[PDB]
């Protein structure tokens, strides 16, 4: 059968939000051995909704300048991070990943509508795919800026931030910026 | 590791406070006149394992290090790791360390001032010596 990294299970994984249920593809036939797919997924529109979730966490992690082709460092960071979450929790860390992406994406968002000089924003609804991508970008960004100058390996930082956002801490930068956009959403309306 | 009980938290080798807890192959670099490659080729003939630190040592190791370090030809640090190959006076293949390092830099500058050469007046004025393209530089430290 098919298990992540030779060992990790995918049939235990459950989606909570119906609003995000299709736009993460992890459960049945989008489980693969590695995040390294090396096929096109930005071919046309919405084809990066049917790419695997851990591939998205991988390909959004070479984001910074000096790392910008080095995907193998990224997949070992993913492997060490899943092992660290599997130690600190014990459960299947993919469930922690899904619960972290679900609990982190915004729900209302502010958009400047007017003219170039009328900054009179209007808090509108968040599209589900952009909620997915905004969540992945916040988790990677919290893994970045909390691992700039430390002793911690960036796999440890990603794993701990994924844990903290999976439970909705006041410690996750992702949950901090989600709460910030949700509070700005209260202001503009 | 272990807990070495003779641990001098301050080292004093050749008029220099050395942070003795630092790695031995990188705490000798801290003084002037010794870099990284040079202290390594010292330690390969100074017969101390790199695994240890700089505060884990015996003074017998310290005195044999300073012995090799002031006698660089007699202990097979041959004549290209040296700080000065052919001096103006004696031409002696010899290492020159911190106080003597500033002394011999000062010596060469005083000489080239006394020589009245193209270098010496640059060094008295404190400008670039190696013919640089200062059409956009010369920023920090000029007034």
């Amino acid at each position: 059968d098919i298990k992540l990294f030779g060992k990790w299970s995918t049939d235990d994984v459950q989606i909570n939000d119906i609003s995000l249920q299709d736009y993460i593809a992890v459960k049945e036939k989008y489980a693969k051995y590695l995040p390294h797919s090396a096929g096109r997924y930005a071919a046309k529109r919405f084809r990066k909704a049917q790419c695997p979730i851990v591939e998205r966490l991988t390909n959004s992690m070479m984001m910074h300048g000096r790392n910008n082709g080095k995907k193998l460092m990224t997949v070992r960071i993913v492997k060490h991070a899943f092992e660290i979450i599997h130690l600190l929790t014990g459960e299947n860390p993919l469930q922690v990943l899904v619960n972290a992406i679900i609990n982190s994406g915004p729900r209302e968002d502010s958009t400047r509508i007017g003219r170039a000089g009328t900054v009179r924003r209007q808090a509108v609804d968040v599209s589900p795919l952009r909620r997915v991508n905004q969540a992945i970008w916040l988790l990677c960004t919290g893994a970045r800026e909390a691992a700039f100058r430390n002793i911690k390996t960036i796999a440890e930082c990603l794993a701990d931030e994924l844990i903290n956002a999976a439970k909705g801490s006041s410690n996750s930068y992702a949950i901090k910026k989600k709460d910030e956009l949700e509070r700005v959403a209260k202001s503009n309306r | 590791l272990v807990i070495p009980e003779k641990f001098q938290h301050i080292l004093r080798v050749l008029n220099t406070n050395i942070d003795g807890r630092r790695k031995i192959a990188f705490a000798i670099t801290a003084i002037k006149g010794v870099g990284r490659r040079y202290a390594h080729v010292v330690l390969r003939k100074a017969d101390i394992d790199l695994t240890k630190r700089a505060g884990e040592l015996t003074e017998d190791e310290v005195e044999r290090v300073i012995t090799i370090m002031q006698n660089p030809r007699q202990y097979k640090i041959p004549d290209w790791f040296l700080n000065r190959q052919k001096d103006v006076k004696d031409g002696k293949y010899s290492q020159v360390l911190a106080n003597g390092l500033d002394n011999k830099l000062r010596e060469d500058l005083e000489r080239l001032k006394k020589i009245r050469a193209h270098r010496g007046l640059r060094h008295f004025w404190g400008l670039r010596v190696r013919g640089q393209h200062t059409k956009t530089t010369g920023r920090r430290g000029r007034t």
Partner: protein, 192 residues
Amino acid sequence: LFYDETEARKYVRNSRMIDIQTRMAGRALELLYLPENKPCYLLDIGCGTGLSGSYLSDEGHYWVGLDISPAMLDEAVDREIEGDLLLGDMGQGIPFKPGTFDGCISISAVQWLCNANKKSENPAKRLYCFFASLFSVLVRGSRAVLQLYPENSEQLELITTQATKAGFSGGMVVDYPNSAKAKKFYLCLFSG
């Protein structure tokens, strides 16, 4: 909100930021004919960490600084300033009695009045509230010089129109205007 402790520190500690803010503050003081060659009392509007306010102290001026950012003010605390720092939103008004200050200066700050994020009055209302109160808190014949970054010519015209309606006269000085990398707009005004 825009700044935090990390970013306020990185801005105030950057040598390139220090040099440019110092040059623009000294240029604003040269354009300020009312303090130029005179002692004066001053209000520094959008004072930040006090980089502009230190340079007011250099010419012997006594000053009050207004800023909306706590972290910019907290970084100013450790810089041995002689001015009074006040946590304040300039778009709600200038909270001094009539005729308090000889002059006012602002470096890199009033373009934020075109922004509609912080409060639920229109930028147009906040801009009027700023200029009308600013005219009042100034002495008669007092001066205001503001270096600012407009996004477009409509923002420049709106700022000019609001200052004009509040009773200010004067104009716009544009230094180095053929380089839109290095060009700087200075609003130079006087009260009645």
